[PDB]
Structures are given as structure tokens and as C-alpha cells.
């Protein structure tokens, strides 16, 4: 397990942390993160309480957090702002699911980056996304 590493890598604290473990990390190309999904989270009761179904925007945020982990471990210090998300929601995600976040970098600039992520539940692909990030660290 490498969650305590994620707690410093990802600055996002509770209740907006959507990474639990880094399965694999290929520097400057690819990252694979894990998110355990439980019914004991606030958005499940906050989003349509009569039926627990994770909002897709939070899967996009998990994809973005994996992307930022990949950036910070494999680019000196800057910040990364999400510029765009082009997402495709294939299938719903439910409590008890292990959500596998897969980021592959396409392009890297001094001032910009483009990544392509897929989130999987076993063999299922449930979201595809093209994300783009900018830098704005002033000092």
C-alpha cells in the first residue's frame, strides 16, 4: 500500500480525495490508480438518495487527481490547473466497486499538458476522458 504517499502527493484532503493507492507508475507516460467505492460517502446520500449511483463528475475528478499524481511524480516546482475535460460516461458505478483510473499522457508543454484516461470496473470500461491542464504557479 502507498496511500500515505498519496496523502502528501495529492494535496486534496477529506472529503475530496479520490485516490487510495497507486498500482503502477510509469514516469512521463502512464499511471494506474485505485479508488475503492463505498456507500459510506457523502455524495451517495447527497446525489439522488433513493438510489446510490456515483456522479460521473467525481470519476472525472479521480481521473484528474491521478493525472496530477503522475505530473508531480513525473514532470523545480509548479501547480497544475484543469483546463478541459471531454468525457464519455459508458456505465454506472456502484458501491463495492474497485474503480481503476488509467492515465496516459499525450502531450506535455512547459505550460500545458494533455492526458487520456479510462476508468474501469474489472473488465468494464465506464468512462473515457480527454483532459487538459495548465500551469499557473506564480511563486
Amino acid at each position: 500500500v502507498n496511500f500515505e504517499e498519496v496523502r502528501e502527493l495529492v494535496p486534496q484532503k477529506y472529503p475530496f480525495l479520490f485516490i487510495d493507492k497507486v498500482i503502477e507508475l510509469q514516469k512521463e507516460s502512464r499511471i494506474v490508480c485505485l479508488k475503492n467505492i463505498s456507500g459510506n460517502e457523502p455524495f451517495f446520500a447527497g446525489h439522488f438518495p433513493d438510489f446510490a449511483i456515483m456522479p460521473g463528475v467525481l470519476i472525472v475528478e479521480a481521473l484528474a487527481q491521478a493525472s496530477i499524481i503522475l505530473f508531480k511524480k513525473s514532470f523545480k516546482d509548479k501547480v497544475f490547473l484543469l483546463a478541459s475535460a471531454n468525457v464519455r460516461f459508458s456505465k454506472p458505478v456502484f458501491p463495492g466497486d474497485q474503480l481503476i483510473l488509467e492515465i496516459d499522457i499525450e502531450k506535455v508543454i512547459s505550460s500545458a499538458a494533455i492526458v487520456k484516461g479510462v476508468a474501469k470496473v474489472g473488465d468494464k470500461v465506464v468512462t473515457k476522458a480527454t483532459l487538459s491542464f495548465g500551469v499557473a504557479n506564480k511563486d
Binding site: 483546463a83 502531450k107 508543454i109 500545458a112 487538459s132 495548465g134
Partner: protein, 83 residues
């Protein structure tokens, strides 16, 4: 294919700015940021979408060469002069 690339680039800017093609083709030589309703981010849009349309990868220090329709067209054709 300067005509194909040139009017498809006119169309790329008309898409990214969601503007009329006649509009921007009238604006060959006026700058992006001041008047063409565009920032660094729409510039990233042009960069990626043209890079994938016309089968290139532009060494994107050429960022310095994108200020208008004119800069974009000349930069792109210099890129396929690289080609």
C-alpha cells in the same frame, strides 16, 4: 495543398472561436488575443486539433508563432516545410 490546408484552417479557427468562417477569413492579419476572442487555451485548441487533422506533431516552441490567422497558417505551412 495550400488551398485545402488554408480553408480548413480558416474552418478550424471558425470552429474553435465558434465564429463564422467568412468572419475570420476577413481577419487574416489581426491578432488573436486583442480582438479575436481567444486566450492561451483556445490556442491549445488550435494546436491540438490541427496537429491531429494534418498528421503532424509541431515542436510547440512554435507557440511563439501563433498570434492570428496569419501566424497560424504560416507556422503550420512551415511545419509541413519540415515535413
Amino acid at each position: 495543398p495550400v488551398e485545402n490546408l488554408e480553408k480548413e484552417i480558416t474552418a478550424i479557427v471558425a470552429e474553435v472561436t465558434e465564429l463564422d468562417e467568412n468572419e475570420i477569413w476577413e481577419k487574416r492579419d489581426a491578432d488573436f488575443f486583442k480582438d479575436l476572442e481567444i486566450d492561451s487555451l483556445l490556442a491549445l485548441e488550435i494546436l491540438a486539433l490541427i496537429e491531429k487533422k494534418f498528421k503532424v506533431q509541431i515542436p510547440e516552441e512554435k507557440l511563439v508563432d501563433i498570434t492570428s490567422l496569419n501566424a497560424t497558417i504560416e507556422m503550420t505551412r512551415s511545419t509541413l516545410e519540415g515535413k
